[PDB]
From Swiss-Prot:
Gene: EXOSC4
Subcellular location: Cytoplasm; Nucleus, Nucleolus; Nucleus; Nucleus, Nucleoplasm
Family: Belongs to the RNase PH family.
Disulphide bridges: none
GO molecular function: 3'-5'-RNA exonuclease activity; mRNA 3'-UTR AU-rich region binding; RNA binding
PANTHER family: EXOSOME COMPLEX COMPONENT, EXOSOME COMPLEX COMPONENT RRP41
Main location: cytoplasm
Protein name as annotated: Exosome complex component RRP41
Lineage, broadest ranks: Eukaryota, Metazoa, Chordata, Craniata, Vertebrata
Quaternary state and interactors: Component of the RNA exosome core complex (Exo-9), composed of EXOSC1, EXOSC2, EXOSC3, EXOSC4, EXOSC5, EXOSC6, EXOSC7, EXOSC8 and EXOSC9; within the complex interacts with EXOSC2, EXOSC7 and EXOSC9. The catalytically inactive RNA exosome core complex (Exo-9) associates with the catalytic subunit EXOSC10/RRP6. Exo-9 may associate with DIS3 to form the nucleolar exosome complex, or DIS3L to form the cytoplasmic exosome complex.
Organism: Homo sapiens
GO annotation (BP), single: poly(A)-dependent snoRNA 3'-end processing
Bilayer-spanning residue ranges: none
Function text: Non-catalytic component of the RNA exosome complex which has 3'->5' exoribonuclease activity and participates in a multitude of cellular RNA processing and degradation events. In the nucleus, the RNA exosome complex is involved in proper maturation of stable RNA species such as rRNA, snRNA and snoRNA, in the elimination of RNA processing by-products and non-coding 'pervasive' transcripts, such as antisense RNA species and promoter-upstream transcripts (PROMPTs), and of mRNAs with processing defects, thereby limiting or excluding their export to the cytoplasm.
Gene3D superfamilies, per the entry: GHMP Kinase, N-terminal domain (3.30.230.70)
Amino acid sequence: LELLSDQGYRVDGRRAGELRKIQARMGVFAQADGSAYIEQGNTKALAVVYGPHEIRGSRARALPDRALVNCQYSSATFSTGERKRRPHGDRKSCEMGLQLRQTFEAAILTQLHPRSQIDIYVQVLQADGGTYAACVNAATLAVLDAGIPMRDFVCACSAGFVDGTALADLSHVEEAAGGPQLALALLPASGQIALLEMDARLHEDHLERVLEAAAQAARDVHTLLDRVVRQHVREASILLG
RNA sequence: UUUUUUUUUUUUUUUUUUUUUUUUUUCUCCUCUUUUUUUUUUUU
């Protein structure tokens, strides 16, 4: 099957260094302390956060120096072509909630809420392509909506490598083809990387170009989400006064 | 030849948990030429 034509067009019609269309939203729910909604291409995510509160259970599991970040991951049973129902014991959810907890224990400026918990929930309504970056961006928007201070605006994007060229924002068809996939979590102002992942084989000479293309695609996600945040804050500033 | 007074480092600790590798596709596809097919035999 052709994943890159001779003309340079992909299966869905975009070039190598081209992203899908994103359409976000802030303030979806009312009861919670924060909310967000993003649809990156054909993947629909959702995130809900709860502000610093009293530790549930009160089983002396607190930290006297910082706060306790608690991230979960879930997925709807109609999120793909087949039903594929799973119980709440899978290790895919555990590893996704652990990479989420790892990146948000580094992005959030947590040394201001001693002996407090932060509960972050992510719900995926339709998965087609990169799920990690869609969850990270939806929870970055939900955290901004909740007013929790943070060092920067963390954004994530993936990449690939086919026929000696570097792709960007891979889809499920391209992902399920046995290629060197790769994902980041970038802080645009400093250029630092919060998380790095990889699978499948790849030569050592092509790591610089796949990593550079992924970082550039994350910097391209940054501008599009930045205009959404600026329009939202100008909206509320106009409403307030 | 210049008296008298203006307190200070948050209180708390004797919390239960009965799971388990993975996980999810890619179609049908013209094999060229001396033949029947030789064959016992012996030295390993």
